[PDB]
Curated annotation (Swiss-Prot), chains A, E, F, G, H, I:
Alphabetic keyword roster: Bacterial microcompartment
Function: The only hexameric shell protein in this bacterium, it forms the majority of the bacterial microcompartment (BMC) shell. Expression of 5 proteins in E.coli (BMC-H (Hoch_5815), BMC-P (Hoch_5814), and 3 BMC-T (Hoch_5812, Hoch_5816, Hoch_3341)) forms a 40 nm artificial BMC with a molecular mass of 6.5 MDa. There are 60 BMC-H hexamers per BMC. The shell facets are 20-30 Angstroms thick (a single hexamer layer), with 1 of BMC-T trimers protruding to the exterior.
Protein name: Bacterial microcompartment protein homohexamer
Gene Ontology cellular-component annotations: bacterial microcompartment
Source taxon at top rank: Bacteria
InterPro entries: Bact_microcomp_CS, BMC_dom, BMC_shell, CcmK-like_sf, CcmK/CsoS1_BMC
Family according to the record: Belongs to the bacterial microcompartments protein family.
Industrial and biotechnological uses noted in the record: Artificial BMCs can be made in E.coli by expressing (Hoch_5815, Hoch_5812, Hoch_3341, Hoch_5816, Hoch_4425, Hoch_4426, Hoch_5814) or (BMC-H (Hoch_5815), BMC-P (Hoch_5814), and 3 BMC-T (Hoch_5812, Hoch_5816, Hoch_3341)). Cargo proteins can be targeted to this BMC. Artificial BMCs can be made by duplicating this gene with a 16 residue linker between the copies (making an artificial BMC-T). The shell assembles into balls with holes where the pentameric subunit would be, and can be used as a model to study assembly and permeability.
Annotated source species: Haliangium ochraceum (strain DSM 14365 / JCM 11303 / SMP-2)
Curated annotation (Swiss-Prot), chain B:
Use of this protein: Artificial BMCs can be made in E.coli by expressing (Hoch_5815, Hoch_5812, Hoch_3341, Hoch_5816, Hoch_4425, Hoch_4426, Hoch_5814) or (BMC-H (Hoch_5815), BMC-P (Hoch_5814), and 3 BMC-T (Hoch_5812, Hoch_5816, Hoch_3341)). Cargo proteins can be targeted to this BMC. BMC-H can be modified to place its N- and C-terminii in the interior of the shell (called CPH). Fusing proteins to the C-terminus of CPH allows targeting of cargo proteins to the lumen of the organelle composed of CPH, BMC-P and BMC-T1.
Pfam families per UniProt: EutN_CcmL (PF03319)
Organism for this UniProt entry: Haliangium ochraceum (strain DSM 14365 / JCM 11303 / SMP-2)
Family listed: Belongs to the CcmL/EutN family.
GO cellular component: bacterial microcompartment
Protein's UniProt name: Bacterial microcompartment shell vertex protein
Transferase among keywords: no
Subunit field text: Homopentamer. The base of the pyramid faces outward.
Keyword Iron found: no
Classification of source organism: Bacteria, Pseudomonadati, Myxococcota, Polyangia, Haliangiales
Swiss-Prot record, chain C:
Residues making up the signal peptide according to the UniProt record: none
Keywords from the named record: Bacterial microcompartment
Organism: Haliangium ochraceum (strain DSM 14365 / JCM 11303 / SMP-2)
Protein's name in the database: Bacterial microcompartment protein trimer-2
CDD domains noted in UniProt: BMC_like_1_repeat1
One of the record's GO cellular component terms: bacterial microcompartment
Length: 92, 95, 201, 202, 92, 92, 92, 92, 92
C-alpha cells in the first residue's frame, strides 16, 4: 500500500514537533502515534515514497532541535501482513 | 510599570547632550481597555513605539535600566509594547 | 563454487521473469529458490541429480549453453530447498562461505530515459518494458548468479518493474525500471543485497 | 481488397514501446500519429508502402507479409502528413474510408484472479509486459487483425493497464491486458467501444 | 487553529508548577496533560501565539526551579491533521 | 503446534522493521506484538520451523540496522501450556 | 495596522525559502517582494505581532541555510505614512 | 501544488545551461526565470518532488561547469500564499 | 531546433566585439543580447552546431582581447521548453 514513515522520540513534545514538520513538509497523512512506555512515542505517517521520505527528513531535522530522536525510518512498501497486524493506519 | 497610550511626540532642540537621539513621546495613562485618561508623561522610547500604541512604561531609576537610557536624565522610558490585556477571563485589549 | 544464494521467498516479478526465460520446472511465486554457480558447466548435471534425488525440490534452471554451471532449484518448503542446497554443496565438497564474493562493478541510475534509448533497451529484454521517460537502474555483479538475488531484493523494496536480470553469462547485469523515487529505493536495496553475501575474494 | 484501415491520433507510451520491441522497421516514439493498412493480397502491400513513402514524409515501422495478408504501419508527429499518406493509400487502392471490413469481436473475456500456472504459461509467449500471478486479464480477438492495435490504443488511454501482447497480423488479432480488475473493466469497456464504433463492410 | 504550547517535565510536580505558571502568565487554556510513561508528563496549553509564547516562557522558568524540564516548545499554527490525530485539545 | 519466533526490540520502529522483514522473508504469520513497558516491544511470528528460523534471521538483520535488538529467539515446538498461558497467537 | 515583517536576502532562492518558511510558520500574509537591484530581494509579510515575529524567526532560520541573509526585522506597528508611501501591502 | 525547484546563477549563460539540464533530466516544467539585478538570474522549475529533485541535482552539476551557482534549492510543497504572491508559475 | 551559442561579457563593448566575431566567423544568426544588470550582457547566436561552435570560439578569442569574458557556452540542441520560456530567439 502506501509508504510508511516513522519517527520515534523519547518525549511527547519532540514527537509533536516531528509530526508537525512531517505534515508541513509534504503530502503525508499523520495517522497518529504509538506509546510504548518509558517515555517513547512514535509518530507514524503514510503516503507516497518521496512524500514520506522528504517528510521524514524534515521531521527528523525539526525533532532533533527539540527532543531525543531515537529512530527515524522509512519503509517504501510494507508487507500486507505488517499492515494487517500492526497499528500502522492501513489496516482493513 | 504604568499601562499607557502614546498620544504625541515632543521635539526639543536645546536639550541635555546625553539624551540626544532619544525619541520623546507623550503618553497618557489608560484603563486596561485602552482609553487615555489622565495627564501626559514625556517618556523616552526604548522599544520603538509610535503614536496610538498602548505601551508599558517604567518610571524612576528603573527607567534607566536600559542600554539606551543608561546614565541619562530619563525618569520615564517605554519598556514594552502591549499585545493583549486580559482582565479575569476576558480580553480587554487586543493589539 | 562461484555463487551460492538462497532466495527465501521469491517475489512475483522475479518469479515471472525467471519463468519466462528458463527451460525447466517453472518457478511459482513465491516458493523458495537455491542458486549455485560452479565451473566447469558439465558438473551441473551431477549437482542436479544429487539434489533432485535427495529432496523434493524441482529443477528450475541449469545453464551450460551460455556460460559455466549455474543451477537453480525451487520448492515450496524452505526446509526442502535448504536440504537440497546442502546436498548440492556437499556433493561439491565446499562450504557455504567458499563462494566468490559478489563484486558490484556498475551501479548507475539513468533518470528519464529518452524514447530512443527506451526502444533500444526494450528490443533486448525478456521482461517488462522500460516505458519512454522513467528512471532505469543497471547493476553488474561478479559472479553472474548473485544478480538474480539482487532482483528479488529490488522487488521487495519498492514498486519498480523488472526489465532484465541476466543470471547467466560472464558478468551478471540487472536492469530495472520505474518512477524516480521507487527506482532509487530499489537500486539502493539491490546494491545493498549484492554487497552483503560473504565469500572469498 | 482493403481489410483494415484505422487511424490513431497518438500512440500511448506502451503500445509505442511494444511496436519498438517487435517491429522490423523504423521504430515509433510515443505521442505521434500512426496509420494501419491491411490488404488482402499479401505481396501488394509493397505498392501501398511505395505510394505512402513517395507521397509524404512518414516512416514505416511494420511491414508484415503474412501467409496470405499484408500489414503496414506509417507514423509521423504531425497528423497532417499521416492523413495525407492515408489519402494517397486510399487513392492508390481506389477505395474509400468505408471500404474496409467491419471488425468482428469474436471473444472478449475478463479472467479475474489469474492463477500462477496460467501466468507462467501466458507470459512466456508474450512480448510486452509480464502479467503477475494474481492480476486480472482481458483477452480479445478481432477480425481482421489490424484493428487490434486500435483496441490496444484506446484501452490504455482510459485505464492504467499492462499491454501483455497484441498480435495485429494474421487471421485474427489478439489482445492481452493485465492489471487490477477495477481498471481492467475500464480498459475493456474502452476497447470494446473503440472497436464497435468502426464502420466498414460487413 | 489555536497556537500550541507544550512543556514536558520528568515529574508530575514540575509539570503542575509549569502548568500553573503557564495559566497565570497569559490567557491560555490548559487542556490537560499526557503521560508517556517513565516519569514523563507533558502539559499542553492552547491559545494565541503571543499568549502561548509568554505562557510557555513563564512555565519553563517556573518548572526549572522545581523539576527536570525535558522539552519546551511552541507551535504557532499546527496542521489540521495534527489536531485530528493527536490529543491536543482541538480535535473535532 | 507451530514454531515460535520472537524478536524483542527496545523501540517500536525497530520492531516494525523486524516484523516487516520477518514476514517478507518466509511464510510466517505475524500474530502481533507485546508491550512490556520501558520501551520494550516484542514481535511474535508463528509458522514452520525453517520458515520461522529464516524469518527471524532476516528480522534480526533488518532490526539491527534500525534499533536496539534486545533478544532474538526461536522455539521450534513450544509446550501446550505455554500456548495456553501466554499471548502467543495459538491459544484455544 | 498589521505588524510588518521583512527578510532581505541577496538572492532570489534564499528569499523564496524565507517566504515559504514564514508563511508555513504562522498566520501571516506574504504580500510579495521588493527588488532593489544588485541581487537584493526583500520578502514582506503582514500580520499579528506574534505571528509576524514567529514567522520571521523561522524564515531567518530557513534562509540562513540557503542564502545570504542581509537583514531581518519586525516592525510591530508601522506608522500610517509608512504604509501610505512604501510598497508594504497595506496601502489604501 | 507542484514541487518547486530553483537554481540561481550569477550569469545568464549558466542559468540557461542549468535550465537545459533540469528539463532534460526529468519531467519538470521550466516556467521561466527571474531577474533580480546585479547579474543574478533564477531558473524556476515545477513538477513532482522526485522529478524536481533529480532535475535540480543535474542542473546544479551542469551549471557549476559553466557559471557561478549562487543557490540551489527544492521546496517539496510550497504554501498556497507563496504561489499566490510570488512569480512561481502556479499562480491562479 | 537550432543550436544555441552564448557569450556573456561584463561590458557592452566586449559583447559587441564578441557578436561581431561570431557573425563573421560562421553562418549564425545573432538574435540579440540580454542585459541582466551589473554590467553583464549576453550575446546570443543561433544556428547549426558546427557553425555555432566555430562562431563561439572566434567570439571568445575576440572578446578576450577587449573585455572580461564571464561565460562562453554552446548548447547543441536546447529543449523545447527552454526556447518557449527563455528569450533565445526561437520562441513560437
Amino acid at each position: 500500500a502506501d509508504a510508511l514513515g516513522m519517527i520515534e522520540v523519547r518525549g511527547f513534545v519532540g514527537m509533536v514537533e516531528a509530526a508537525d514538520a512531517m505534515v508541513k513538509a509534504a503530502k503525508v497523512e499523520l495517522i497518529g502515534y504509538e506509546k510504548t512506555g518509558g517515555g517513547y512515542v512514535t509518530a507514524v505517517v503514510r503516503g507516497d515514497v518521496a512524500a514520506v521520505k522528504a517528510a521524514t527528513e524534515a521531521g527528523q531535522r525539526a525533532a532533533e532541535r527539540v527532543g531525543e530522536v531515537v529512530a527515524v525510518h522509512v519503509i517504501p512498501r510494507p508487507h500486507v501482513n505488517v499492515d494487517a497486524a500492526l497499528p500502522l493506519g492501513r489496516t482493513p | 510599570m504604568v499601562l499607557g497610550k502614546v498620544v504625541g511626540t515632543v521635539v526639543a532642540s536645546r536639550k541635555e547632550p546625553r539624551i540626544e537621539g532619544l525619541s520623546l513621546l507623550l503618553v497618557r495613562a489608560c484603563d486596561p481597555d485602552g482609553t487615555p485618561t489622565g495627564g501626559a508623561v514625556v517618556c523616552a522610547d526604548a522599544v520603538g513605539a509610535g503614536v496610538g500604541e498602548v505601551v508599558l512604561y517604567a518610571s524612576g531609576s528603573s527607567a534607566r535600566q536600559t542600554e539606551v537610557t543608561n546614565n541619562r536624565p530619563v525618569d520615564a522610558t517605554i519598556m514594552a509594547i502591549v499585545d493583549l490585556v486580559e482582565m479575569g477571563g476576558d480580553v480587554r485589549f487586543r493589539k | 563454487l562461484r555463487t551460492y544464494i538462497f532466495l527465501d521467498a521469491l517475489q512475483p516479478q522475479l518469479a515471472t521473469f525467471i519463468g519466462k526465460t528458463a527451460r525447466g520446472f517453472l518457478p511459482v511465486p513465491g516458493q523458495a529458490s537455491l542458486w549455485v554457480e560452479i565451473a566447469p558447466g558439465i558438473a551441473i548435471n551431477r549437482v542436479t541429480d544429487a539434489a533432485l534425488k535427495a529432496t523434493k525440490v524441482q529443477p528450475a534452471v541449469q545453464v551450460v549453453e551460455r556460460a559455466y554451471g549455474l543451477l537453480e532449484v525451487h520448492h515450496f518448503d524452505q526446509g526442502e530447498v535448504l536440504a537440497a542446497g546442502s546436498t548440492i554443496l556437499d556433493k561439491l565438497e565446499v562450504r557455504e562461505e567458499g563462494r566468490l564474493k559478489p563484486q558490484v562493478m556498475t551501479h548507475q541510475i539513468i533518470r528519464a530515459v529518452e524514447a530512443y534509448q527506451t526502444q533500444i533497451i526494450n528490443r533486448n529484454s525478456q521482461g517488462m518494458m522500460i516505458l519512454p521517460g522513467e528512471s532505469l537502474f543497471i547493476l553488474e555483479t561478479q559472479p553472474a548468479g548473485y544478480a538474480v538475488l539482487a532482483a528479488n531484493e529490488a522487488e521487495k523494496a519498492a514498486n519498480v518493474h523488472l526489465v532484465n536480470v541476466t543470471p547467466y553469462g560472464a558478468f551478471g547485469r540487472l536492469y530495472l525500471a520505474g518512477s524516480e523515487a521507487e527506482i532509487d529505493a530499489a537500486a539502493e536495496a539491490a546494491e545493498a543485497a549484492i554487497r552483503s553475501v560473504s565469500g572469498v575474494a
